[model samples]
Target: SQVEHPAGGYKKLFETVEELSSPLTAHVTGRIPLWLTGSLLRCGPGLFEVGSEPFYHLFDGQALLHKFDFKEGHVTYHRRFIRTDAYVRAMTEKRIVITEFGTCAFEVTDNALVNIYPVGEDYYACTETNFITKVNPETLETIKQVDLCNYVSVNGATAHPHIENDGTVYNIGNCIAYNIVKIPPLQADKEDPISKSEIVVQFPCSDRFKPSYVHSFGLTPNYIVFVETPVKINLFKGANYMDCFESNETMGVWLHIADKKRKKYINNKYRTSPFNLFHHINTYEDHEFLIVDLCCWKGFEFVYNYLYLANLRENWEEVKKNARKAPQPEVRRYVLPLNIDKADTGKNLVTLPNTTATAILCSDETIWLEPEVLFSGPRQAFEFPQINYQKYGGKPYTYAYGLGLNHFVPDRLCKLNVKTKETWVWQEPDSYPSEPIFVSHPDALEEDDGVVLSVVVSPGAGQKPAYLLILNAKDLSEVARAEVEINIPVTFHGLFKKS
Candidate 1:
């Protein structure tokens, strides 16, 4: 094992929310894009430890939000501690209150941890639980808490939901009743938006030990693909979610492919042996084949890798050792031929025709995993991938923007041309960035015509908050940057909501 250095590096990353000042003025670096205009909204686990009761995992903390407003080549920073019911009780009582996915006194939420997307009138911050929080985009305030289970049939929903081009919101949900639910679009028309979202579709769970723990699913021009990994949700009282999931070798995952327009399952349950998936780059149809680009982890390594990073000196060895278990996550391509009529074997319910073996998996006539593993990424780990939302999703895209792994936190933003196999990366030593959100120019025609916005956190000595790096989406060069004076913890995902 490689001896890893500890402490000092992540000092600013793990901290409690105390005495945060107002909308701070940022020192400019390069130059903000001339035509770019929008607010990049981000939220994450900011409150690390409550008094002596420290959080065990990064996901086990109270939520904090950061907002960057880009207007006329200038940027302003705004931040707020997300006020959850758990956070309020903990603060007034001066102790830990609500339990999160990881720690208890200890945690209010991070699955209060992942996604931020625009809803009807305002924005929504979602977790894995039934409760989906509503947020104010400008102030970074948690204004309302709406429980989806109240409106939908499922018990819980994943935070990693997908938004269609016209701004229709959809989320993948799970329950032990052997079923899945995707709530209908929230109707993102700013003029007359629908208040409630109805159930879009529901499919069987395919008889697993528990509902397959899914972070995200895929979408194509005509079909919707649910790449349900074998990661099971073994629910038990007091046990953390990460601990509750177990992978079954005999019990592989199921592929729930449905028609996007008709809301009907084409291949109801296709089986495969994949451990986990977090994000979907894009999906599109080619003749009869459907392509899904995913960033996959070998197992529940994503759940385990960041568990032991509470105090670096005490847990760096464990965190470093786990990194050796696998190369974190690899970008894999999964293909499904829609033209093939699947033979229905009633009882066994075997998988239909899928791209089980690819040309590269094994040169010989050997059985391999599904679709072609586009890039196994032994040398590089990829996650939080972004593409031109309007132009690419549900269609073939040439490029993907994402973060590159460094230890546990991603240290660089990269642009990968999926077609050309060319990659460009922007990195500053000891600095970490969130997902690179690509903002396209108004009159853009080319695929990569836009600007990439990422919140880069510099946590070394004298490194305060973090900065917003603006890069030209075409060449991945620094156009300009806005640096904040205080620390903003690592965020999971963000959106460049154009005004």
Candidate 2:
């Protein structure tokens, strides 16, 4: 179940006593239930305490949100030098673990904190600036920390090891060079430094140009995939941070495959179009991945933004060749009218289709309302619907099931049929929703055959506190709604766990 708090904004859309009711709540359907955390629960509008540094918030199976408070003693251990990328993994019903990269003043440290994945665990893992550590889930005690920095730079990027079915642990890191590490299962007290652990592959980089950052990464049995942005001279051109241009030359995405005991990535085949910055990359399975590439063109003081879809399924050589081809022009141009003189124009372009080869793109056109000055009076009201890219052959036809307008109303949920390109808008009597998460649940109604749950954010508007709205997976209609009185602000991404 997902929950959110309502912040005040436009009120004309809803009228009448019931429509204006404060602290509204509604149940959503046709999506998955996810475990909520990160900015999805911390920043924007959510039920977290204001003024606190945005940290991870964990929720219980019952949909109760718990803010994990770190120990003050642990506070000293917090490396103020680096921005933390924290992730959680559940080992058992009662045990969870959290890991983050530690750094000091731009210098990366191998010292990683391995504690209970969630705040509830006690055991901790502390290692050298170049090692991997395993900790007790509850004691906040370090079970072991192995130094891998000696083998690779602590500044390198390493992903959390994913435990396989055979009990072996697999992980990869991008240090001075990129490499993969395999840690065999461990015995209670046997500590020979996990001799089998070795570097599988390595990619060298000059001191001047390192991968800007490994935004996100994933792994499969056959391959280890990661996204990287090449370092540019523009980063140093300006007097300080202000001198750099908002736009970058271009970025690349690579998939490294394990060969024998080493890994190798096809370099020439991975380069993407210029000025495109790859933001998010996700892989559904081996040989399949989705990348969200963002392109921004900045003028002297203004920026124009656009989004591109990059698909890498066929041979890398072919994908690269196709990306270079010009895009098909749309018949109708969508322009978003700017309120500010310097506001950046927004456009979305689809380069690669989803898991499939179909492509879709959409741009927004702003309809401005002005005074006709009839007898020196204001003009009448008008309607302007925010347009998406469905009209174009961008969004996949088969995958379209629900349409979320979080970018616009942030509350309205629409059902869509990708195959037919049909949409149906659903309204809740007293619901102000957040972005809906799609879930696949059994025992759902017929309409929810493959659907699970939709997490809606119902804010607390002075009257009653905010609550989470739960909907049936199919039909997209209402189901069971659990009202949370706690103050939850608006948030970004959240996950759902089976009870």
Candidate 3:
């Protein structure tokens, strides 16, 4: 038994034991950073290692407070769920409204149900499971819940409700006996039952997509513009062939309009191939809407890729006459290579020319500076070998970095001049940018007369943290920047409100 042991065995064991006995740190960071920091200190008999888990522990530093400790056996499971794109609109000086959806009891946890907006002191949200709930903005409390579920039970069967300037709430949800109900305004605090809800428009199952995933909608004096992706096509099969053969399959988009009285909801069908995924559709006041389409065939291959501008107002009637005719009259198509891979195509829109207008393209690229070296003396003509690098590693001078490695080709902000057949591009400095929310200065009345503001997420250098950059509306120049310690990865979408 006393014979022998491996060399360094006891030493290695002691070293491991020492490492396992070290103290643990319990500091954490959040997505958004404010100028706030706290520290805590505690006296103990040295430090000891626990298993890898997340738990609450106390530590001693410059200050004193209990903190979250990540140690073994304390790890908690986090549930990953789908997040609906949030939509925001200002209700009043002291209130803003947002809408999104989550899971319902009737379906699996993965299935979605309407989650009413979280009401805040200056903001209130109303959501309905089968009905709508209104919350008091300042108090963050649900003041009313309108039960419309009695008339509509199918999940994903509701639309985002629009609140008018006169405080009138309008929504289209699944009806008990029909496809949808167009609920009109009633007296304040009116408790009209869902069974008696009025029907605005009803369509056959073949014509309508069940559990409608309507992206965005617009309303005008004479019409309502909404974008929907009907789950009618076999995307897997269609994509398989379309990428290889360029097949022109039919995907779905419906443009519906109604009279001011909401008497009719006329639907015009639009189709594209499965390769071309339609992302965003925007409507304007002057009877027109902008469609943003992207082809995902090459998957993260190119940036600033193909885009098309279709003038829907001119051919609304023709689109209705034949649903397949919607794509026939696309006025212009722009094909620009963004020069980067995995660029997001559904990010945001640029500044447009008119209020009755919209811009379909926007992005920004970053270029980095690289160092250059040169030698002087009795110089001679240098011959650069062009041989394949893998074939001859020693044939030429080689280094790890090269020309194409430094530049960060940015996203773009593009605007189409419909009347002049011209396009304008605005380049920003940051990477992921929120869609430019166009606002009019109190003095400007024309579409192109006002300024544009965009928010961009910029990365931090060495010790500096990331922050937000604000740009001038008209010139696309940096106006102001707010520094923070947050590390927000790329986000899907964001909304803006005037301060």
Candidate 4:
């Protein structure tokens, strides 16, 4: 019997990795499009163990900034640690210095490992805090730290921001009321546009003490949709953020739609059963109905519970066994009736013919929503959903690329056809891939007319440890790959910034 398992069972994925001395040119496997010229800016937990202390949670690792530069037909990759107070102090003092989402710290470090977002032509690496660090995109060097509270009244804002073509930014934050903040485009005089931020809209929480975890929200043409789930954050608790989580079954989920121009909720009761979500795929209007497609996990809690590094480093059999303990996130499409009527009780208000999603008026004056599951399998989870945002975001769209979690380990790259419910997945045995970021072709007309980028890592001796994988978004086939000799840690949300 193969005692160690043929493919090192995800043990090295969470292990700490050293930074490369300089940018290394990747060995090209297939043909990379010459027109693909830009950098794939990625950020995630890199250094898992600092000194003798090991980060228990997957999100607690020190922030690592990864840049995959694509020039002409060649690709070069390099990684650097973002010099946040969490990382620098930890290195200098030789201990964990920051308070992470799951790991209780000994200073509250702003470990900006969550995501990378743009604020008026400037890229900032951010966590779920008011502090965001500006970095040079080309060099991946930490420039300066900026606080959202300095401009707006948000305590902590989302790393996910909706950037308009004109460079305007829109994002939401938890000020207890879940306020939407907007930053206009950069001025001609080169002033800090983020300083000109304003709280355009706010959604009051159902409970005064316990606010739902608002990771990301949805936006349509005229309105912004916020999903307040039962997975509440106990504000009154004295413990760490993770310990304070309370999944109240009775609270359920409330969907609030805010008018863009009016800057207020539409005054509707759009409630549904409890479900937990981190990313919103896309939302659009079709024939007086708002269609919201998102990735959802069953019930509420336990998804984050299963993400502990101890649980993830188990043997192959144990990894497969423990995955059955939690619910995998499935891609679901929910259709909401725009002009709901109280007189339409007991009748399905959803008029969409193709989708099976329903909206029924309940006795408590709330619209109970039932969604159509777009993709689901026994242990497969489609997460870190991405679309062609430049052309089809917040509108009727088709393709979405995501990372596939087979029993909680990122093991594949997946593409889904939202309209037809068909899926195309790219997988290699024993290889783990990170979030798939879609970069469209410049003159493309079709929705999926581009390439999908994901950093794939394999942990075993005598093998290429990591590589930049490029797949043709049309059919999920391999367009090319640039393999690197050094090990690259798994990453979270990032973007393809075209130069």
Candidate whose TM-score is highest: 4
TM-score for each model: 0.87, 0.43, 0.41, 0.97
What is the descending TM-score order?
4, 1, 2, 3
Preferred candidate (lDDT higher): 1 or 3: 1
lDDT of each: 0.68, 0.29, 0.26, 0.85
In model 2, which regions exceed 4 Å deviation? Answer: 1-174, 179-199, 203-208, 230-247, 250-262, 274-456, 460-464, 474-476, 490-499
Give the residue spans of candidate 3 off by over 4 A: 1-154, 157-163, 169-199, 205-212, 225-230, 233-257, 260-262, 267-430, 448-453, 489-499
Report how far off residue 60 is in candidate 4 (Å): 0.2
Clashes of each: 5, 56, 28, 0
Taking the tens digit of each residue's C-alpha lDDT, what string does model 3 give over 162-245?
A: 444343434543322223444444444565533345555543332332333332333443444433334332223211111221
RMSD of each: 4.8, 17.1, 22.4, 2.2
lDDT of 2 by residue, 359-395 (tens): 1121233212111110100111000111111121111
Rank by lDDT, descending?
4, 1, 2, 3
Error of 4 at 497 (Å): 0.9
